[PDB]
Design a protein around this ligand. Structure first.
Ligand SMILES: CCCCCCCCCCCCCCCCCC(=O)O[C@@H](COC(=O)CCCCCCCCCCCCCCC)COP(=O)(O)OCCN
Ligand SMILES: CCCCCCCCCCCCCCCCCC(=O)O[C@@H](COC(=O)CCCCCCCCCCCCCCC)COP(=O)(O)OCCN
Ligand SMILES: CCCCCCCCCCCCCCCCCC(=O)O[C@@H](COC(=O)CCCCCCCCCCCCCCC)COP(=O)(O)OCCN
Ligand SMILES: CCCCCCCCCCCCCCCCCC(=O)O[C@@H](COC(=O)CCCCCCCCCCCCCCC)COP(=O)(O)OCCN
Ligand SMILES: CCCCCCCCCCCCCCCCCC(=O)O[C@@H](COC(=O)CCCCCCCCCCCCCCC)COP(=O)(O)OCCN
Ligand SMILES: CCCCCCCCCCCCCCCCCC(=O)O[C@@H](COC(=O)CCCCCCCCCCCCCCC)COP(=O)(O)OCCN
Ligand SMILES: CCCCCCCCCCCCCCCCCC(=O)O[C@@H](COC(=O)CCCCCCCCCCCCCCC)COP(=O)(O)OCCN
Ligand SMILES: CCCCCCCCCCCCCCCCCC(=O)O[C@@H](COC(=O)CCCCCCCCCCCCCCC)COP(=O)(O)OCCN
Ligand SMILES: CCCCCCCCCCCCO[C@@H]1O[C@H](CO)[C@@H](O[C@H]2O[C@H](CO)[C@@H](O)[C@H](O)[C@H]2O)[C@H](O)[C@H]1O
Ligand SMILES: CCCCCCCCCCCCO[C@@H]1O[C@H](CO)[C@@H](O[C@H]2O[C@H](CO)[C@@H](O)[C@H](O)[C@H]2O)[C@H](O)[C@H]1O
Ligand SMILES: CCCCCCCCCCCCO[C@@H]1O[C@H](CO)[C@@H](O[C@H]2O[C@H](CO)[C@@H](O)[C@H](O)[C@H]2O)[C@H](O)[C@H]1O
Ligand SMILES: CCCCCCCCCCCCO[C@@H]1O[C@H](CO)[C@@H](O[C@H]2O[C@H](CO)[C@@H](O)[C@H](O)[C@H]2O)[C@H](O)[C@H]1O
Ligand SMILES: CCCCCCCCCCCCO[C@@H]1O[C@H](CO)[C@@H](O[C@H]2O[C@H](CO)[C@@H](O)[C@H](O)[C@H]2O)[C@H](O)[C@H]1O
Ligand SMILES: CCCCCCCCCCCCO[C@@H]1O[C@H](CO)[C@@H](O[C@H]2O[C@H](CO)[C@@H](O)[C@H](O)[C@H]2O)[C@H](O)[C@H]1O
Ligand SMILES: CCCCCCCCCCCCO[C@@H]1O[C@H](CO)[C@@H](O[C@H]2O[C@H](CO)[C@@H](O)[C@H](O)[C@H]2O)[C@H](O)[C@H]1O
Ligand SMILES: [Zn+2]
Ligand SMILES: [Zn+2]
Lengths: 52, 102, 217, 79, 124, 62, 88, 96, 244, 79, 124, 96
């Protein structure tokens, strides 16, 4: 998700943001969360072929 | 399979920018993936027009602002229209959008 | 020859983007009469060429003063703008920048008994822009020096850890004064660059070279 | 992610900071005047004078003075 | 370095019909963008060593000049008043909120990147 | 207290050197970086209605 | 087909071997390009505004130094010392 | 090593080691925001008293408001003019 | 020593040893010597053979410097300008409009054109460069590029829309009154050749009709031939604006 | 051959040359004495004195003297 | 990075008997030691720029001090006497012979490397 | 570019451009080794005469052996004591 990608960014490995999470400021939507789950299934391209 | 490489390069490039832009995308990878966009953006800073989109916002020029963004990404269609111009040249034709009344 | 790589969306890039766009917002471009299209695009670029870089100059003067003002609040450090020639040297430099911009429009010629009085109000902007920066960095630090001396007289005379509540109340007023000097350090950098957009923006006017010929209807 | 790529480059100074500290030092060393509490003298006077008489008390204040105005050297006693 | 989509087209076309579906994760990884791995830890850069020694040399130079001043004990206690606010700013400032407030200052980070859509670039 | 410096020209030329370095560093190092990051977002947001329409008309996929 | 020569230096995919060097702006490459295209055309008002302040404060330094020389020669001719004392 | 430990050490001190929770100051203090206001003035009051205790026998350059530190009240520490206090300190220094 | 310096002067400082130092970087040295007025055909033959194995690896600034140098020297080497046009065609994305307008004006001075060169230059100005780069160009350089495409018959309507942006009251006002006449009369012939009448042709026609005393009777006939042709294409009537 | 590998690395200084020039400069700036033709004076004397009287003629020799011993400044005329 | 002899053994063993002899130049090149190609020319290093500007700053500082000297014209003509020998040393010194004389000063370059012989390490 | 040309330029001057062969000094001179001995003293004699011609009206700090340059013979250029020569030069300078 976008908040998961900010948590892996170099800004949150810095000292004043080590104990912060990007979900705490703006939480991901359920449409954002279900699309992050839907994208994880399609990262296997064989599964994306059999789905399509 | 005729023009699949250009259409999937645009998809591959924009999906990598949109995944990483504003988060961890380096400026070197942006200038690698789109060298002509960085060339056009660097022209504005060189010619003292670094605030030109702010200038178009000041005068309410929404159609010129849409023309500004489209002309700065106009090289995305250049691999296609150099291909379609060479296709019409091998078949003896003239290219359609290259002509004034065509 | 090898420039460094930058992360997109870095906090100093986002801070300097909002800062530059704020001082560019102070002198906005005028909306022309005609709709902006390819006919009016060279007249928009030429009107941008005749405009001074007040957006660039004010964020130059904002960043160079808020960095100098906050040096006065760092330990083992004093503010460069607490010196007279530094802070007033920036204010005469802005006033001379606005005057040279105004003089380059007409002829580089300097423009009954009314205009000597309006000249004094104009050339006082040379003094007052830098002196307001200098006195604010000086009088706040001078008041901090006097009150730290009066706060030091209590534990010197009345024992070090002997009696707390009198030296607690003066160390609270001293701590609120350094926090006030933090607010003045940011505000006086803002007031300087707001006034620099006002003073230089007076002469930031040229006539729009619109279309001399038109095919109407 | 690109996070481990940006941790590879260490601390770096701003790009022209050497030209800033060159201009600031050159404004403080190329003053064209004697250096703040000293006076240029003749070569005959400099060679004849001991080091203790060549120093002045005002230019050597005490590092942590027990009385305000203590000086580290006493200078020349010849007035 | 050739582009990765033409490598996908070349690797998918060259593969057999039998081992197409098994080799799709191999073609996926060959066109994956490079993300450089975490290198070996190095303590201090050269310019980081100049910056910390230069700030230490500047602090010792300014503390030596403050101690030789006329109001010398007022100068050293003004360093206590100034360093106390640096401690209080580490306690009071919402460093996650200030990060996202600065992120909303630039329009490039205040919104998500709106560009090319999927249906416009579908290749059939 | 310190009111007038030892040289007024030295303090003014120090302010001139510091402000011209910040003017150089902004125009050369910060604003080219800012505008590469701003106008990539700004050109994409200003074109995306006309870019996706032009790309829709071009591909014969539908 | 469209065959990768049509998008050679125009469109590139995200890199797979190594992250390249950053492309410099012309102002980062040479100071002479910055001086002739932006610094002198756009910012010569500041540079002349700085030049005004350095020359004006050098005039005020000359008036301050002539005031010291006038007060110095007035004390030498009057049989006085020009400076009072050191505190030591 | 020397830098990688010091980063791990101060991270534990900045975040994990809190003296507000280990000393149980929720009984005495209302908020954590008012603890850091008292820790602020508490840092100032310590740094005032430590800088004075690091060298106590000194004549003050700051004006004392007619008050004397300890049982001195006539010595060089309490003298108003500093030219007299320098001569009185030299007699006190050779004895002590 | 009156003759020891003169003996050193006739053998060492000669134009032939000025060339022998200039062989290392021909695009640099031929550009700055011809800027100083050294336009000599015998040296520029030696310049053309020294740089010919190096043209394909030249940068865009070196190609532009070399092309402008051989324009000022007025020397045409067709095998040199074949490799120059092969360098522009191979690297057209890297070239700038400010550089290409100087390359086209050299290719227009002596008639040298390729259909691949005309396509790659038009693709570079329209798509590889900023769309407001003709605004910074100067109308005398844009009219030369318009004439170069009209004489070769190369109809590129996407290029013609980009180049016509540069013509305005700003860019034509910066020209001399004699130089504005040759710019207006050569841009109006190129716009009438392709049948392309953009909205910015009002500035080119209006630069002739605000001062018609410079123009002859037959020239005002072919100006108002384009004016009525642009009035049908843009669908209106031509009117001169007066400020007020 | 390895010739093109050794042309990749440019000019480099000797490995601890910064510590050599740090030690040589610190022996010339931390002398603990006034600087070769100057004398430390009081702050009262420095503030009252003009710049031309603060300089000495011996410390300003002429860059290309037409007569041996020409000085650039004349100093204080008060003896 | 694995060693190249085990890559030779692995590539020769894996090849067919039919295409062994044709693929021997490919296995030869895969085990060839890397010799980095001539990179792009860069005019001056950063430390080369400090060295040339620092020597120019030192020359101008010493020429300014020599010109202000008492015997100033003798000092500037001693620079002529000293720089004339630097020109004569470029003319007289046999720079190839001095290179091979210095090469014979170290025993590592005065002789060829005598070590492992062929018959002792033959592998049959 | 600026450095790569200057290396190629000086390489041509150091090796390829020889004034010993282009001027044909084999007729006048025996060896190339005696040409570089004459080019050595020839470099010294030029640099002596150029440094004196760069500023000729100067009083010499070196002791002239009772000799005068041109028709001066009584001016400040020929004066023995330099305190007198400085006063004589100031009268000559305001006129010229
Ligand atoms: C604002 C709210 C309050 C916040 C807290 C209070 C603020 C003050 C707190 C003080 C901390 C400041 C930052 C801490 C820096 C030291 C710790 C550190 O992280 O060290 C890193 C570097 O720290 C520094 O070196 C910064 C020091 C800056 C001081 C500048 C002084 C200048 C003196 C030298 C000038 C010479 C110029 C030469 C020009 C060529 C290590 O660098 P690296 O190589 O391992 O790679 C990591 C890079 N991301
Ligand atoms: C008169 C006598 C003075 C004697 C006093 C000592 C001064 C000696 C002068 C020489 C000292 C060194 C000069 C430094 C300038 C050249 C270095 C340089 O070009 O800058 C950088 C080289 O890279 C560049 O950025 C080149 C760009 C030019 C630098 C600055 C340009 C001029 C800025 C001044 C403001 C101009 C605007 C106003 C002009 C009137 C390196 O800087 P850095 O170490 O801080 O960055 C490396 C960190 N990784
Ligand atoms: C119309 C456009 C003009 C463009 C020019 C821009 C000028 C302003 C830009 C900022 C640069 C300022 C540096 C110039 C300082 C000039 C000061 C001066 O002329 O007086 C000096 C003259 O002093 C000397 O004779 C010694 C030589 C000093 C040379 C100064 C070198 C410092 C230059 C700073 C580097 C600038 C670049 C660094 C990054 C911006 C010293 O001043 P003083 O009052 O202490 O002494 C006066 C005599 N008693
Ligand atoms: C904007 C701020 C700029 C800085 C201004 C502050 C310093 C001004 C330098 C002072 C120059 C005058 C020195 C002087 O002694 O006066 C001379 C006279 O020169 C003049 O007449 C011209 C003076 C004009 C300078 C006025 C500058 C004042 C600007 C006010 C803004 C600064 C506010 C803060 C000042 C601490 C000589 O007269 P006298 O000695 O014979 O008088 C008899 C006393 N015993
Ligand atoms: C209670 C008992 C105490 C036990 C003693 C041990 C506990 C530690 C106590 C405090 C030690 C402070 C050491 C901090 C400096 C060393 C940390 C460091 O620099 O390491 C990293 C961490 O950097 C920082 O810590 C920077 C954090 C600064 C933020 C500001 C925090 C608050 C500052 C308050 C202001 C204080 C002002 C002065 C007050 C007297 C960066 O380097 P790295 O190589 O490991 O990173 C990899 C990249 N190469
Ligand atoms: C012995 C017989 C007679 C022989 C001829 C006479 C000898 C004198 C002739 C003078 C020539 C000396 C060498 C020529 C050097 C300049 C030409 C050159 O080759 O430049 C190269 C570098 O030249 C130099 O920079 C050397 C300059 C040395 C002078 C040292 C002065 C020191 C001043 C700065 C000290 C600051 C210390 C800072 C510490 C961190 C370019 O370097 P690069 O990056 O392109 O890579 C090539 C590396 N192989
Ligand atoms: C008392 C006040 C003095 C003030 C005067 C200014 C002095 C300031 C002091 C700090 C200035 C910088 C100190 C430099 C030393 C640390 C740098 C270093 O460690 O050396 C090199 C870092 O790499 C090393 O070689 C580390 C090895 C240590 C350096 C020298 C060791 C000591 C040598 C002294 C002799 C010791 C034997 C006798 C001891 C009694 C970098 O040198 P480079 O730039 O010339 O080489 C880079 C070229 N690519
Ligand atoms: C049995 C083994 C002992 C090991 C120690 C080895 C010592 C020798 C190795 C070489 C290092 C020499 C540096 C020490 C210099 C000491 C000079 C000194 O003590 O007097 C200074 C005392 O002057 C001062 O008070 C100011 C402080 C000066 C500190 C000197 C710093 C320079 C250190 C050089 C760096 C060494 C490392 C660099 C690379 C080798 C200045 O001398 P002066 O005659 O000019 O003035 C005397 C007072 N009028
Ligand atoms: C004494 C007066 C002066 C005080 C000091 C002045 C300080 C100057 C720095 C403050 C500037 C910050 O100003 C910042 O401008 C940027 C321009 O990108 C705005 O940026 C943002 O605006 C809006 C609303 O927030 C968003 O929808 C938008 O996407 C984004 O551009 C921020 O809303 C504003 O916070
Ligand atoms: C929570 C509420 C947040 C409110 C945020 C918006 C207010 C931010 C305050 C920052 C300062 C406002 O900045 C304000 O800018 C305007 C224009 O924009 C300036 O206005 C100036 O514009 C030009 C400049 O020459 C002149 O023509 C005009 O007469 C003058 O007023 C003001 O002098 C300045 O005060
Ligand atoms: C150097 C020391 C510090 C000195 C700094 C002085 C300048 C400070 C600039 C920041 C102040 C402006 O504060 C600015 O407020 C505006 C609203 O007005 C916010 O603008 C936006 O924030 C977020 C966007 O993510 C949303 O809640 C909303 O769309 C809007 O409020 C900016 O994100 C914030 O940055
Ligand atoms: C001793 C006095 C000290 C105080 C000095 C302050 C005076 C400063 C003014 C300097 C004037 C000369 O400076 C010169 O001005 C002319 C016009 O005159 C400018 O000329 C032109 O510049 C650019 C074109 O590139 C345009 O943006 C500008 O509008 C135009 O006027 C020059 O670019 C500048 O270099
Ligand atoms: C706006 C803030 C400043 C407020 C003060 C404004 C008044 C300052 C101007 C005072 C004018 C009198 O200044 C008059 O001008 C000349 C310049 O020709 C000064 O001359 C000055 O320059 C010359 C050479 O450049 C030097 O001798 C010296 O630096 C200084 O004396 C004279 O000393 C004086 O005769
Ligand atoms: C810094 C300025 C220069 C100062 C240098 C002073 C030291 C000079 C050292 C070199 C002098 C010694 O000169 C040294 O002569 C011996 C013989 O004696 C040579 O030794 C050998 O040379 C070669 C080997 O290849 C053969 O001819 C032979 O085997 C032997 O003569 C060295 O190769 C040469 O280097
Ligand atoms: C005033 C008296 C002192 C004058 C100055 C002294 C200068 C000192 C430097 C000169 C040293 C050179 O000394 C050098 O020693 C090396 C040791 O490796 C010898 O090195 C060589 O010796 C012999 C014969 O040449 C070879 O067979 C052998 O392989 C090799 O080691 C050189 O023959 C000699 O030239
Ligand atoms: Zn203070
Ligand atoms: Zn000597």
């Amino acid at each position: 998700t976008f908040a998961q990608r900010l948590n892996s960014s170099p800004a949150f490995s810095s000292f004043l943001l080590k104990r912060e999470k990007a979900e705490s400021e703006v939480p991901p939507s359920e449409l954002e969360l279900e699309a992050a789950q839907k994208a994880a299934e399609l990262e296997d391209p064989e599964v994306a072929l059999r789905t399509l | 399979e005729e023009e699949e490489l250009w259409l999937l390069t645009l998809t591959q490039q924009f999906k990598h920018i949109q995944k990483h832009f504003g988060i961890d995308l380096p400026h070197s990878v942006v200038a690698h993936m789109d060298p002509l966009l960085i060339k056009k953006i660097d022209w504005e800073t060189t010619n003292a027009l670094e605030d030109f989109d702010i200038t178009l916002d000041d005068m309410g020029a929404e159609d010129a602002k849409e023309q500004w963004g489209a002309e700065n990404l106009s090289h995305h269609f250049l691999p296609l229209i150099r291909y379609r111009r060479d296709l019409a040249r091998k078949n003896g034709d003239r290219y359609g959008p290259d002509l004034v009344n065509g | 020859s090898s420039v460094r790589d930058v992360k997109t969306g870095s906090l100093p890039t986002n801070f300097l983007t909002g800062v530059y766009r704020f001082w560019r917002s102070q002198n906005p471009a005028e909306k022309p009469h005609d709709p902006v299209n390819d006919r009016l695009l060279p007249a928009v670029v030429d009107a941008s060429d005749k405009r001074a870089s007040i957006g660039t100059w004010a964020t130059t003067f904002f960043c160079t003063i808020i960095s100098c003002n906050l040096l006065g609040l760092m330990p083992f450090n004093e503010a460069p703008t607490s010196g007279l020639g530094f802070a007033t040297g920036l204010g005469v430099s802005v006033w001379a920048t606005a005057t040279i911009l105004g003089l380059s429009k007409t002829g580089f010629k300097f423009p009954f008994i009314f205009v000597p009085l309006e000249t004094i109000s104009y050339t006082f902007r040379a003094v007052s822009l830098g002196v307001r920066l200098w006195v604010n960095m000086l009088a706040g630090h001078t008041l901090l020096h006097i009150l730290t001396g009066m706060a030091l007289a209590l534990p010197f005379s009345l024992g070090f850890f002997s009696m707390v509540p009198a030296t607690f109340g003066v160390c609270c007023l001293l701590s609120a004064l350094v926090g006030l000097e933090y607010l003045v350090a940011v505000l006086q950098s803002g007031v300087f660059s707001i006034l620099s957009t006002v003073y230089v923006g007076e002469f930031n006017h040229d006539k729009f070279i619109g279309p001399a010929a038109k095919i109407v209807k | 992610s690109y996070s481990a790529y940006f941790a590879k480059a260490g601390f770096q100074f701003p790009a022209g900071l050497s030209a800033l500290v060159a201009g600031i030092v050159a404004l403080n060393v190329c003053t064209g005047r004697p250096t703040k509490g000293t006076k240029e003298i003749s070569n005959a006077e400099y060679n004849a004078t001991p080091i203790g008489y060549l120093q002045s008390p005002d230019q050597h204040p005490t590092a942590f003075p027990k009385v305000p105005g203590m000086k580290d050297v006493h200078g020349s006693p010849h007035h | 370095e050739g582009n990765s989509v033409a490598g996908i087209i070349k690797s998918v076309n060259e593969t057999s019909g039998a081992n197409l579906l098994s080799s799709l994760k191999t073609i996926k990884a060959q066109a994956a963008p490079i993300y450089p791995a975490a290198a070996s830890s190095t303590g201090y850069s050269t310019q980081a060593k100049i910056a910390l020694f230069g700030a230490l040399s500047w602090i010792l130079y300014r503390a030596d000049g403050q101690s030789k001043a006329h109001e010398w004990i007022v100068d050293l206690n003004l360093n206590v008043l100034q360093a106390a606010w640096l401690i209080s700013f580490s306690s009071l400032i919402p460093f996650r909120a200030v990060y996202f407030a600065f992120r909303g200052m630039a329009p490039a980070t205040a919104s998500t990147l709106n560009g090319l859509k999927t249906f416009s670039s579908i290749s059939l | 207290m310190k009111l007038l410096p030892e040289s007024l020209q030295q303090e003014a030329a120090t302010a001139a050197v510091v402000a011209s370095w910040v003017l150089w560093h902004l125009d050369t190092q910060l604003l080219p970086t800012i505008m590469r990051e701003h106008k990539l977002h700004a050109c994409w947001a200003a074109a995306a209605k006309r870019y996706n329409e032009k790309l829709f008309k071009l591909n014969p996929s539908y | 087909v469209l065959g990768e020569v049509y998008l050679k230096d125009i469109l590139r995919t995200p890199p797979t071997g190594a992250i390249p060097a950053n492309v410099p702006h012309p102002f980062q490459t040479s100071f002479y390009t910055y001086a002739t295209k932006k610094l002198i055309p756009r910012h010569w008002y500041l540079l002349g505004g700085f030049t005004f302040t350095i020359t004006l404060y050098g005039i005020l330094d000359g008036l301050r130094d002539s005031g010291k020389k006038k007060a110095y020669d007035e004390a030498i001719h009057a049989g006085k010392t020009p400076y009072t004392a050191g505190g030591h | 090593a020397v830098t990688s430990f010091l980063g791990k050490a101060f991270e534990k001190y900045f975040y994990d080691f809190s003296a507000y929770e280990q000393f149980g100051l929720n009984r005495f203090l209302s908020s954590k925001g008012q603890y850091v206001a008292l820790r602020h003035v508490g840092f100032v009051m310590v740094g005032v008293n430590v800088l004075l205790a690091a060298n106590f026998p000194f004549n003050p350059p700051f004006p004392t408001i007619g008050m004397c530190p300890a049982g001195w009240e006539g010595t060089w520490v309490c003298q108003a003019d500093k030219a007299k206090a320098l001569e009185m300190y030299k007699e006190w220094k050779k004895s002590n | 020593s009156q003759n020891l310096v003169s003996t050193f002067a006739n053998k060492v400082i000669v134009e032939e040893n000025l060339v022998n130092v200039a062989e290392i970087d021909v695009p640099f040295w031929s550009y700055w010597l011809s800027s100083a007025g050294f336009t000599s055909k015998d040296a520029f033959v030696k310049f053309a053979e020294a740089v010919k194995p190096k043209v394909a690896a030249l940068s865009t600034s070196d190609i532009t410097n070399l092309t402008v140098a051989f324009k000022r020297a007025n020397y045409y080497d067709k095998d040199l300008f074949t490799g120059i046009e092969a360098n522009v065609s191979a690297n057209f994305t890297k070239f700038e409009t400010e550089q290409l307008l100087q390359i086209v004006a050299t290719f227009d001075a002596f008639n040298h054109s390729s259909v691949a060169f005309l396509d790659d230059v038009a693709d570079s100005i329209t798509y590889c460069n900023h769309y407001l780069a003709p605004v910074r160009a100067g109308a005398d350089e844009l009219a030369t590029l318009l004439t170069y495409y009209a004489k070769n018959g190369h109809e590129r309507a996407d290029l013609l829309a980009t180049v016509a942006r540069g013509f305005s009251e700003v860019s034509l006002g910066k020209l001399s009154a004699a130089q504005r006449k040759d710019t207006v009369l050569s841009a109006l012939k190129a716009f009438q050749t392709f049948g392309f009448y953009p909205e910015s042709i009002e500035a080119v026609i209006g630069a002739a009709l605000v001062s018609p005393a410079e123009y002859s009777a037959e020239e005002l006939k072919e100006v108002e031939a384009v004016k009525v042709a642009a009035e049908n294409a843009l669908g209106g009537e031509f009117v001169l604006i007066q400020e007020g």
